Design a protein around this nucleic acid. Structure first.
Ligand code: DCP
Ligand code: CA
Ligand code: CA
Length: 426
DNA sequence: ATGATGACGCT
DNA sequence: AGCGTCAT
């Protein structure tokens, strides 16, 4: 139990666009539609680096971080769109703008947290209560959930994918107690009805398809989203967690895909998320720190309290370019010229941002990488007082020039990064 | 060695 | 403040 919390207090969705940069290019160029295709940055080196891949091309084994020339070996008919190039660098404006299209539609339904260029979390708790006030006690038909998967179902007593989806959904809805407006499962179900609507509106008004996850917190909603991609949505109930987590590799859960997840596996000698339940909160805290330990203890039971933050715009605006291998900047003149190119794109994006969103950045963060992967090697800041490219590139040079151990610059820089931050209204 | 981003934690 | 981790 009567005093044990179960993490069923919210309805949270994570919406993520399907092969996003590819859809943006396919909307614009109908020849690319329903074909194996990919988006590449640059062209000179091995046909360019693949940044995004349609599902038709994934069926040939093509992935991101492949060189286009190598992708062609797996998929000879592969079609390519390339990222716009401005001032000698890749420019993502087209995708940032398509992103705004989608975010503004989602923001009509509820408060969103912009999680990336093509993903947003939604807290649907209030919206769900609303929809439950209307539809006073009346059944939810499977027709309101035409693309929803219920994770863990069907169980017990078809041969095709859509057959299985529906069988599971029928089992789910048949068991659903609609007379209790406090039922966590009913609330998730209504949550999923709203997300069907949201996803319909996105596709109607933009042409873009997406997937979604619906559950009681962000981590489960994110996990749920990727269970049935593309163009589908997945409901992960509290009750589904023990079986789902029982064979779920630790690295699949958000924030456990890197070093901490590896420590968890190595120190505890476990593989799957469910196995974490057999450790006390104190043991987990002793191994991984108080915050991580408490987080892990709750999370392996499907419980997480990270709030959906009310934030629709990025908190930073940055411009970055890598200079790998022989292309690494070796002279002072090069460093200054590329700082200028970056500052000019940055100035362009800052002026737009100020006009649109009534805010101004006050700090300029300058970050470089040295040949050989020193320490980002180095990060320094200065005041951003004027949206002026020549001043910003000059200031950035001023704060990094001391790092030169040499007309010549050594060690060669393999990356430059300018980032505007610490925004104030207006 | 996708190269281009973005959010947040630690000290 | 500057570096590290984790992710799209
Ligand atoms: N390391 C990465 C990962 C992604 N992206 C870009 C290209 C993607 O189209 C977009 C969204 O990334 P996702 O990881 O969501 O991948 P997609 O949306 O392309 O595919 P999926 O349908 O698997 O989400 O961000 C990128 O530039 N660099
Ligand atoms: Ca995506
Ligand atoms: Ca994404």
């Amino acid at each position: 139990g009567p005093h044990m919390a179960t993490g069923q207090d919210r309805v949270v969705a994570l919406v993520d666009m399907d092969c996003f940069f590819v859809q943006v290019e396919q909307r614009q160029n109908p020849h690319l539609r329903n074909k194996p295709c990919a988006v590449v940055a640059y062209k000179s080196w091995k046909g360019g680096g693949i940044i995004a891949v349609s599902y038709e091309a994934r069926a040939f084994g093509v992935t991101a971080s492949m060189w286009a020339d190598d992708a062609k070996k797996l998929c000879p008919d592969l079609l390519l769109a390339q990222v716009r190039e401005s001032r000698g660098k890749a420019n993502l404006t087209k995708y940032r703008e398509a992103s705004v299209e989608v975010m503004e539609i989602m923001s009509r339904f509820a408060v969103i947290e912009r999680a990336s260029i093509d993903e947003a979390y939604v807290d649907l708790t209030s919206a769900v209560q609303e929809r439950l006030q209307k539809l006073q006690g009346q059944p939810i038909s499977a027709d309101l959930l035409p693309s929803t998967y219920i994770e863990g179902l069907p169980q017990g007593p078809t041969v095709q994918k859509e057959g299985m989806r529906k069988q599971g959904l029928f089992q789910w809805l048949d068991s659903l107690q609609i007379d209790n407006l406090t039922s966590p499962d009913l609330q998730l179900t209504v949550g999923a009805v709203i997300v069907e609507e949201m996803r319909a509106a996105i596709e109607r008004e933009t042409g873009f398809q997406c997937s979604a996850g619906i559950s009681h917190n962000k981590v489960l909603a994110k996990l749920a989203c990727g269970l049935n991609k593309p163009n589908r949505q997945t409901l992960v109930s509290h009750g589904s967690v023990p079986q789902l987590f029982s064979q779920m590799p630790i690295r699949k859960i958000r924030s456990l895909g890197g070093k901490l997840g590896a420590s968890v596996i190595e120190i505890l000698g476990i593989e799957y998320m469910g196995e974490l339940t057999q450790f006390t909160e104190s043991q987990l805290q002793s191994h991984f720190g108080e915050k991580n330990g408490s987080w892990l203890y709750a999370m392996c039971r499907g419980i997480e309290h990270d709030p959906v933050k009310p934030r629709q715009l990025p908190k930073t605006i940055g411009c970055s370019k890598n200079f790998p291998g022989k292309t690494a900047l070796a002279t002072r003149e090069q460093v200054q010229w590329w700082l200028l190119q970056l500052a000019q794109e940055l100035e362009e994006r800052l002026t737009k941002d100020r006009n649109d969103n009534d805010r101004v950045a006050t700090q300029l963060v300058v970050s470089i990488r040295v040949q050989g992967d020193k320490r980002s090697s180095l990060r320094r800041c200065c005041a951003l007082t004027r949206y002026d490219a020549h001043k910003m590139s000059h200031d950035a040079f001023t704060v990094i020039k001391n790092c030169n151990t040499s007309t010549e610059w050594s060690p060669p820089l393999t990356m430059l990064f300018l980032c505007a931050t610490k925004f104030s209204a207006s």
